[PDB]
Short mmCIF file of C-alpha atoms and ligand atoms in Angstrom, two decimals:
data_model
loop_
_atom_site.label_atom_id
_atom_site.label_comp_id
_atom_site.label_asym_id
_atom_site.label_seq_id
_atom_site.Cartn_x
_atom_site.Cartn_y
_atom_site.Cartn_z
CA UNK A 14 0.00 0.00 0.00
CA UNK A 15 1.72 3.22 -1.61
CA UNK A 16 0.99 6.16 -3.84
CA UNK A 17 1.99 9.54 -5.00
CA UNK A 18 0.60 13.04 -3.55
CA UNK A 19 2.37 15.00 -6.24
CA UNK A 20 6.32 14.41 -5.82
CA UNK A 21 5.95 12.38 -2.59
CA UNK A 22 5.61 9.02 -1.37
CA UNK A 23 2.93 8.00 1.40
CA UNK A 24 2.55 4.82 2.68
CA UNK A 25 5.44 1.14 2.98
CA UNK A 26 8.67 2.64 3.24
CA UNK A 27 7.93 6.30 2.54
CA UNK A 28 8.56 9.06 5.26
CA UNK A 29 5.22 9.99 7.32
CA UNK A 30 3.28 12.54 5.00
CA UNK A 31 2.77 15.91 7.44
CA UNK A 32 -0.38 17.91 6.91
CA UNK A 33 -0.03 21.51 8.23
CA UNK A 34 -3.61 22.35 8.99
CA UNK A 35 -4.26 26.29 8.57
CA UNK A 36 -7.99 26.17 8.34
CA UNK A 37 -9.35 29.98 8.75
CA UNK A 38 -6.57 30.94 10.83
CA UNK A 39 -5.33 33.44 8.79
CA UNK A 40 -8.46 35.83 9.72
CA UNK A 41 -8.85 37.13 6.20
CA UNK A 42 -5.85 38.55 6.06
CA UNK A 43 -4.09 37.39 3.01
CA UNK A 44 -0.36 38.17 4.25
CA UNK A 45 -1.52 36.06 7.48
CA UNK A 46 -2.41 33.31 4.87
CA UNK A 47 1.63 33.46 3.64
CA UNK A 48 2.87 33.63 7.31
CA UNK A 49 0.97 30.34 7.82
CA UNK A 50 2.47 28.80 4.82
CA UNK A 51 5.74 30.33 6.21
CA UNK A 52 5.61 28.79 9.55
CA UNK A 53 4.32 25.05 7.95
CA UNK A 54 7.11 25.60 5.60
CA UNK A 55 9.87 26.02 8.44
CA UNK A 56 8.53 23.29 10.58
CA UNK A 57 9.08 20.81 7.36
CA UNK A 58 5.30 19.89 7.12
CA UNK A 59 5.25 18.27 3.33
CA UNK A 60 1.35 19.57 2.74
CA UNK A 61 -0.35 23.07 4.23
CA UNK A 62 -4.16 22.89 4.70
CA UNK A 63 -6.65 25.47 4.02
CA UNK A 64 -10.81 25.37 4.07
CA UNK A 65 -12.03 26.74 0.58
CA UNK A 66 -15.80 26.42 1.19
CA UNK A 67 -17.94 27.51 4.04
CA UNK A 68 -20.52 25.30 6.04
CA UNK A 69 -23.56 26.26 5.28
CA UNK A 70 -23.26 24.46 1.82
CA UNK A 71 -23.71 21.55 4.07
CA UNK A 72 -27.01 21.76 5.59
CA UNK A 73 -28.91 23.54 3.30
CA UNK A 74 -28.96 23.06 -0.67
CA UNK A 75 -28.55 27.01 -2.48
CA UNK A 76 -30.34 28.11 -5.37
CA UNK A 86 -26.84 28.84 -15.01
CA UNK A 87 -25.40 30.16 -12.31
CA UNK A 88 -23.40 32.96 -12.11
CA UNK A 89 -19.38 33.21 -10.16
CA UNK A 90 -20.33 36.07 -8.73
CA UNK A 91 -22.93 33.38 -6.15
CA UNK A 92 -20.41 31.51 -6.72
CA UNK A 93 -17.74 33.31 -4.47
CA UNK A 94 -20.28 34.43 -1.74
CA UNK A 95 -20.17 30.40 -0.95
CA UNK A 96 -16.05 30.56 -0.74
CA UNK A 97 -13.79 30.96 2.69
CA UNK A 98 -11.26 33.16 1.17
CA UNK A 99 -11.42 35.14 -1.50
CA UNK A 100 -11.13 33.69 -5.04
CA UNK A 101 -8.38 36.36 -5.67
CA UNK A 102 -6.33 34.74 -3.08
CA UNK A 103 -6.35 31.13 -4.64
CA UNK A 104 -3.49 31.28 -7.42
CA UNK A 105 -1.33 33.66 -5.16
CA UNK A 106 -1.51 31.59 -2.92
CA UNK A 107 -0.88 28.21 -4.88
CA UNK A 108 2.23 29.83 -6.37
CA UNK A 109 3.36 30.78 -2.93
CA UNK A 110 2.99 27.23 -1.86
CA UNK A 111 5.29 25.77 -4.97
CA UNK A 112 7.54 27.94 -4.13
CA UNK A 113 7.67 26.90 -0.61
CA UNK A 114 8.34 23.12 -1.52
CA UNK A 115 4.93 22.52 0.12
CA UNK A 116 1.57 20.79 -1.10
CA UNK A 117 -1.49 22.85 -1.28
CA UNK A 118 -4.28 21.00 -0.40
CA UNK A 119 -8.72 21.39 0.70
CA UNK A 120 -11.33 19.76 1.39
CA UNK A 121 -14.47 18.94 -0.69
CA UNK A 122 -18.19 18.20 0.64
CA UNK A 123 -20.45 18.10 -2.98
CA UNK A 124 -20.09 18.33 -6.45
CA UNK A 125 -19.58 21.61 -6.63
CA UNK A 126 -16.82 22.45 -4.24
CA UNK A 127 -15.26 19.57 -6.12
CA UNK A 128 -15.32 20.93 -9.39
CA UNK A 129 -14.06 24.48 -8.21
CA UNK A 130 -10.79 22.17 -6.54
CA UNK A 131 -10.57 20.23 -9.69
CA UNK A 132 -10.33 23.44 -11.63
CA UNK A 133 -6.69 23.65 -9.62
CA UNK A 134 -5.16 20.49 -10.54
CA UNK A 135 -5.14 19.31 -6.73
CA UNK A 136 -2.60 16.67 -5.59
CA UNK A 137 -5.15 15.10 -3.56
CA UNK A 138 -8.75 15.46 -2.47
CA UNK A 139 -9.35 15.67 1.38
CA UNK A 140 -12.76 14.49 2.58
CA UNK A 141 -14.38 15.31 6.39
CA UNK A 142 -15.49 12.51 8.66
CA UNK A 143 -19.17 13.43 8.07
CA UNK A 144 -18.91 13.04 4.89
CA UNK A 145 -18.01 9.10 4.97
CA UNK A 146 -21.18 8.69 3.77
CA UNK A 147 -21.92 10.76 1.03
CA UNK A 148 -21.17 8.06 -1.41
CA UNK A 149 -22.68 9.73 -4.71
CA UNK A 150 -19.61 12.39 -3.80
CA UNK A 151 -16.96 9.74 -2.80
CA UNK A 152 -17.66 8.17 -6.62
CA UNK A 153 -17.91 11.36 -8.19
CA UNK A 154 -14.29 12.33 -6.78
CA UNK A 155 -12.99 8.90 -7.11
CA UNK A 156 -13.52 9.21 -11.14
CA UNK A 157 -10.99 11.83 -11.25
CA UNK A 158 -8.05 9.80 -10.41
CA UNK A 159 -6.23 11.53 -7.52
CA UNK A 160 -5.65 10.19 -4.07
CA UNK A 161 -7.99 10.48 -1.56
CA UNK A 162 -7.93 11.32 1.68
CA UNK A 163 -10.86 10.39 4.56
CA UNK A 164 -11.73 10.86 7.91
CA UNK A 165 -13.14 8.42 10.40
CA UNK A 166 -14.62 10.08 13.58
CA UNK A 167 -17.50 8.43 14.95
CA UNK A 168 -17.36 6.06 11.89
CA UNK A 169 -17.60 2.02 12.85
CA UNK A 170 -15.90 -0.25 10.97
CA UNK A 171 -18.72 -0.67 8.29
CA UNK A 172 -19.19 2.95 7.00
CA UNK A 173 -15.14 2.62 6.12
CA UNK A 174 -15.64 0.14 4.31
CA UNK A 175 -18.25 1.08 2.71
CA UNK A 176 -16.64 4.30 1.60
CA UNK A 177 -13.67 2.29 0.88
CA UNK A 178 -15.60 -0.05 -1.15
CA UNK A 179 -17.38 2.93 -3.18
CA UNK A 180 -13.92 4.60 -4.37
CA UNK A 181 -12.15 1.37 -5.47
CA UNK A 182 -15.32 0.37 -7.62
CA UNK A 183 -14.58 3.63 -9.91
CA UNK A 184 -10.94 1.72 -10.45
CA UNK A 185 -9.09 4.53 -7.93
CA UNK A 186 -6.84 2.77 -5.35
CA UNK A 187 -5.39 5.81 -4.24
CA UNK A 188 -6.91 5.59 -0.69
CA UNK A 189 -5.68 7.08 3.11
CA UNK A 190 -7.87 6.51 5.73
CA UNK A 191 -7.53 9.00 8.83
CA UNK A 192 -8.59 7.84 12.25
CA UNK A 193 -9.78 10.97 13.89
CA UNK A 194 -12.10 11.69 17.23
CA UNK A 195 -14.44 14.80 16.39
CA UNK A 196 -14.01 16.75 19.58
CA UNK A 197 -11.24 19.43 19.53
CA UNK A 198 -9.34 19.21 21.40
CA UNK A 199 -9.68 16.02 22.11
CA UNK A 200 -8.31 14.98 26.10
CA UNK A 201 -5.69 12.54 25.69
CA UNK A 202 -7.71 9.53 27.03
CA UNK A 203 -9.77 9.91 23.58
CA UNK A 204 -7.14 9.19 21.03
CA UNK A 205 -7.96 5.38 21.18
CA UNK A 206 -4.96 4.50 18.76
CA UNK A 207 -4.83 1.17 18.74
CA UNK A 208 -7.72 1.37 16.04
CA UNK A 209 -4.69 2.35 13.88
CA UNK A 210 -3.21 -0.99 13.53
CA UNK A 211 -6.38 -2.52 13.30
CA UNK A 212 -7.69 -0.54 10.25
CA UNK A 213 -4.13 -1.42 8.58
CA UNK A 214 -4.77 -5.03 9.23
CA UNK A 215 -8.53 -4.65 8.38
CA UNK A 216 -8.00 -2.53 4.67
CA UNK A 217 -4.62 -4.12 4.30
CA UNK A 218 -4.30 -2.33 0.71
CA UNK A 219 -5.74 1.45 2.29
CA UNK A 220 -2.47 3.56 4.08
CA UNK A 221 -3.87 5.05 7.41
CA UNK A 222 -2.84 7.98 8.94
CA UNK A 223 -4.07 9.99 12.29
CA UNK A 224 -5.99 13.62 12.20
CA UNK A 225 -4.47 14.72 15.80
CA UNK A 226 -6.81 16.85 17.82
CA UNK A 227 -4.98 17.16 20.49
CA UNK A 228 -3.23 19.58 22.67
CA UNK A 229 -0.03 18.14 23.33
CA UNK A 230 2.91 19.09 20.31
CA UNK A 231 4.38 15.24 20.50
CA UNK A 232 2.44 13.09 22.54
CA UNK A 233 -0.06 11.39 20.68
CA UNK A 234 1.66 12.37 17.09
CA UNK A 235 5.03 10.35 17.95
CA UNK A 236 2.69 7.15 19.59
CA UNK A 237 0.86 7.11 16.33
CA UNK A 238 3.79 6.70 14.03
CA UNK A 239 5.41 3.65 15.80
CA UNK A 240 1.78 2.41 15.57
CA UNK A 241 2.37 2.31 11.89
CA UNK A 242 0.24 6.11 10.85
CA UNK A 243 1.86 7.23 7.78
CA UNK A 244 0.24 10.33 7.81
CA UNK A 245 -0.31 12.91 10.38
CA UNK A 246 -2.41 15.75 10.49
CA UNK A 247 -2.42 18.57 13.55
CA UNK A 248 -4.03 22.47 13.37
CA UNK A 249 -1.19 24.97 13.29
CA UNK A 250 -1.72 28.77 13.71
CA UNK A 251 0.58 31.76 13.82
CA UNK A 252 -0.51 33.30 17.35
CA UNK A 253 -2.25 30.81 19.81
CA UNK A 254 -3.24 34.13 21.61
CA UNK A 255 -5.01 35.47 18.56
CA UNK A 256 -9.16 36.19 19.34
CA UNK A 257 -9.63 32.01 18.17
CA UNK A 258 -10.78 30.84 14.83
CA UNK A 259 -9.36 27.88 15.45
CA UNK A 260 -6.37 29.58 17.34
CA UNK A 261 -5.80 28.86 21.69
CA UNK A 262 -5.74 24.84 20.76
CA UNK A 263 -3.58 24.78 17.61
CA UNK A 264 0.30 24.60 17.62
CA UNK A 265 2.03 27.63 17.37
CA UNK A 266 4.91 27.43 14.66
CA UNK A 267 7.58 26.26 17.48
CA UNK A 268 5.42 23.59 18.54
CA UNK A 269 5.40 22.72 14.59
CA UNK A 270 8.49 22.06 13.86
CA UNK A 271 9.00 20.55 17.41
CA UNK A 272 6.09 18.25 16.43
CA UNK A 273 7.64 17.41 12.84
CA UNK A 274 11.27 17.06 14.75
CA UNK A 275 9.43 14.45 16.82
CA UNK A 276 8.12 12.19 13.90
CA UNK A 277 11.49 12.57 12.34
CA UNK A 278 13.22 11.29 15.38
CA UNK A 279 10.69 8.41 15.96
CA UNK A 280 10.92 7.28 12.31
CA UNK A 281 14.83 6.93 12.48
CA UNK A 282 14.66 5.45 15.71
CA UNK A 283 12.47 3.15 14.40
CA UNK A 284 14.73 1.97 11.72
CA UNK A 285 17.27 1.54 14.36
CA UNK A 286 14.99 -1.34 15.85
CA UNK A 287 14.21 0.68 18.84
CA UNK A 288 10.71 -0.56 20.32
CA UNK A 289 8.92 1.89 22.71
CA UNK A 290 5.70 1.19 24.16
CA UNK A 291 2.54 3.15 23.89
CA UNK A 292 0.59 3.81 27.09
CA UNK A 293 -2.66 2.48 27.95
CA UNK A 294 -4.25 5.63 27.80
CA UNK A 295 -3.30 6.53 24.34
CA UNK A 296 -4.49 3.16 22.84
CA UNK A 297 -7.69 2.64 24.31
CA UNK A 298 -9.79 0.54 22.59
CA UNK A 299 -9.37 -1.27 19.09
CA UNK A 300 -13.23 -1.16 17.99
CA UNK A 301 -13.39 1.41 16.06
CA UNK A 302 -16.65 3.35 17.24
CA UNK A 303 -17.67 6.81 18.12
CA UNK A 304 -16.03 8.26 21.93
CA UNK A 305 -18.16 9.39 25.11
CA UNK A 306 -17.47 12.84 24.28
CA UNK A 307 -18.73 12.38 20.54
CA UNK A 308 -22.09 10.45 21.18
CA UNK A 309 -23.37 8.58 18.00
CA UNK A 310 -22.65 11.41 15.43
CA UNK A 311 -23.09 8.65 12.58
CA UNK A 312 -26.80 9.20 13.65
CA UNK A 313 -27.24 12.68 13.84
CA UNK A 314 -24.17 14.32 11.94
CA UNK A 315 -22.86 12.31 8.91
CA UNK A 316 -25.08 12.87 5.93
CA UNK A 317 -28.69 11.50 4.90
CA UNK A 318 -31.50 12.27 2.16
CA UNK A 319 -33.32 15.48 1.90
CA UNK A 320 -36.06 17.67 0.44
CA UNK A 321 -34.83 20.28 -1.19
CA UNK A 322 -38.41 21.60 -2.03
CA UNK A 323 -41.86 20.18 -0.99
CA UNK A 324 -42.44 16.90 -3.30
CA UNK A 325 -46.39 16.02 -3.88
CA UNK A 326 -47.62 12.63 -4.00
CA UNK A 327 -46.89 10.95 -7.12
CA UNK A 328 -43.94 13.24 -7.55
CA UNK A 329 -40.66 11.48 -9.29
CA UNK A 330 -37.63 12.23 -6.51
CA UNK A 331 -34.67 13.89 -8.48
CA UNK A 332 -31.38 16.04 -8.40
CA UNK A 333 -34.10 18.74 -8.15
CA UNK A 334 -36.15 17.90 -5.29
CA UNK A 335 -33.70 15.74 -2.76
CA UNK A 336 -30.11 15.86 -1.80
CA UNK A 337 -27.64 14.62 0.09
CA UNK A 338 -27.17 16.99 3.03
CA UNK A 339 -25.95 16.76 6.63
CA UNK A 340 -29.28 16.97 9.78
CA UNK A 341 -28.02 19.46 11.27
CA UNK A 342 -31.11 19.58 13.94
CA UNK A 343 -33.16 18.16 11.95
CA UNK A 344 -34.21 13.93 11.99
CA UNK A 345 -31.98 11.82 9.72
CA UNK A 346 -32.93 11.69 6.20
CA UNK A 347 -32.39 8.03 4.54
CA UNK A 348 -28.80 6.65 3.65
CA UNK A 349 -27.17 8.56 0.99
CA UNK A 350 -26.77 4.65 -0.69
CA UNK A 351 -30.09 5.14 -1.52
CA UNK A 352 -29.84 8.26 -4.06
CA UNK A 353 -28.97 6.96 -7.23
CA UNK A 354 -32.13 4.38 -6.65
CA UNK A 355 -34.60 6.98 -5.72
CA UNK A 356 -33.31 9.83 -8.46
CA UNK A 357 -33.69 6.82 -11.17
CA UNK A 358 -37.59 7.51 -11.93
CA UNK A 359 -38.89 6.69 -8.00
CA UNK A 360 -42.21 8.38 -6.75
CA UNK A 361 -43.34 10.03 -3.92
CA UNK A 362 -46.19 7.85 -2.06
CA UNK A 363 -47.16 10.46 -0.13
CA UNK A 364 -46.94 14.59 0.50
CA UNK A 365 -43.48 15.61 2.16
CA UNK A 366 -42.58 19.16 3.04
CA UNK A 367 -38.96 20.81 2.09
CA UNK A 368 -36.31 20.41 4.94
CA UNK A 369 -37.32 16.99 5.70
CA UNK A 370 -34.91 14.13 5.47
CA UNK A 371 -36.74 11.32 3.88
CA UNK A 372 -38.00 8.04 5.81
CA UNK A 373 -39.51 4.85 4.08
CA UNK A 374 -42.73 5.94 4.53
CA UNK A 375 -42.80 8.52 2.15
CA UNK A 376 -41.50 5.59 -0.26
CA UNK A 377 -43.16 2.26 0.34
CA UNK A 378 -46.88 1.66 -0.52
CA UNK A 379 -49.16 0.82 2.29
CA UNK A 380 -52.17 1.63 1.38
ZN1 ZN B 1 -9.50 19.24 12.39
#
């Protein structure tokens, strides 16, 4: 299990791949978003990470469309983009996002990405993880509060296209996360369990070296960890992320584990850090594979009798609302199904609304 993010190697016998994870810390201020690429840059992180699109894409669908919508739906500026591209070739570091639909796909496509990054509540959203998986890059995905079925399942979904470029990121969704919560030996266990997948850890954590080090002589081969240029600043994601020091101490740690490693030196990992091997959703998560990954819903209010399509469902994430069926389900319902019964807009679909009873 190997690949290629650009001119790198991740997984057997390649170096740990580092993701640098900016977010929105550079508070709109473009120079702040070259500082950050600065400071990744310094520490040695191979990739920087920035969000492109904003949330409420997520949770509510929004109505030929013109760019200028389109960059009201953006994080940063669409000014900023190539800038700061360049800025990161010139660096020696990999640019790289995250995608949640079609859409926000396409825009990253448009790029030439090295890699597409998907968010844990988004394991689910197959009709995306196939329509990203047909453009041949690697792919990147999270697993908090995923069980051992919805990874494969997404798993499943991107090797069907014919893409085995796959990294699977064991991740807990609370930030930060206390120590106790890393539950790291379900890093082994995923290698054994998707023996042709690399797996890597998404580090919420406070601690600079802690939990990154124990994960790579448990085998991660990537590691991800929030970085900002101020920990003081009025927090985006600031007072929990490492400052640039802490970086580069952080990278200097995996660095120093991985040689030691191929010195044969052992060193244990404590029982707090590995927790448990099933590979479930934490205490301080609480089923978010119920209420927070994605499901089925009206977009608009569908009338009895009404065929279900691209125009009148979607795959969107609760938010407070009930679930919505599986996302698995999509393709089937958008290929000439019928409504059996009224349902209003905002309303994640159920079987009632689909199954004759009457
Ligand atoms: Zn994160």
């Amino acid at each position: 299990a190997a690949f290629q993010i650009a001119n790198k190697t991740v997984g057997k016998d390649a170096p740990v791949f580092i993701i640098a994870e900016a977010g929105i810390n550079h508070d709109g201020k473009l120079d702040q978003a070259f500082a950050l690429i600065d400071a990744a840059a310094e520490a040695g992180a191979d990739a920087v990470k920035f969000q492109m699109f904003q949330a409420d894409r997520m949770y509510q669908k929004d109505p030929d469309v013109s760019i200028f919508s389109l960059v009201q739906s953006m994080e940063m500026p669409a000014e900023w983009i190539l800038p700061l591209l360049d800025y990161c070739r010139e660096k020696q570091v990999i640019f790289l996002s995250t995608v949640c639909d079609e859409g926000s796909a396409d825009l990253l496509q448009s790029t030439s990405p090295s890699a597409f990054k998907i968010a844990s509540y988004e394991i689910n959203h197959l009709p995306l993880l196939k329509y990203v998986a047909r453009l041949n890059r690697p792919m990147i995905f999270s697993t908090a509060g995923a069980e051992i079925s919805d990874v494969h399942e997404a798993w499943r979904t991107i090797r069907a296209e014919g893409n085995n470029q796959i990294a699977i990121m064991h991740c807990v969704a609370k930030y930060p996360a206390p120590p106790e919560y890393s539950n790291l030996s379900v890093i082994p266990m995923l290698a054994a369990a998707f023996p042709e997948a690399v797996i890597g850890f998404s580090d919420h954590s406070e601690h600079p070296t802690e939990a990154p080090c124990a994960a790579v002589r448990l085998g991660a081969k990537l590691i991800e960890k929030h970085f900002t240029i101020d920990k003081n600043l009025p927090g985006a994601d600031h007072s929990f992320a490492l400052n640039p020091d802490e970086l580069k101490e952080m990278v200097d740690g995996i660095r120093k584990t991985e040689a030691e490693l191929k010195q044969g030196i052992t060193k244990p990992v404590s029982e707090k850090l590995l927790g448990s091997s099933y590979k479930t959703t934490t205490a301080i998560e609480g089923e978010i594979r119920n209420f927070a990954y994605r499901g089925i819903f009206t977009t608009a209010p569908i009338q009895k009798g009404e065929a279900f399509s691209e125009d009148n469902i979607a795959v969107l994430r609760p938010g407070q609302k009930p679930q919505g069926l599986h996302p698995r389900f999509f393709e089937l319902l958008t290929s000439g199904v019928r409504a059996v019964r009224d349902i209003p807009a905002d309303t994640g679909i159920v079987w009632d609304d689909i199954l004759l009873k009457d």
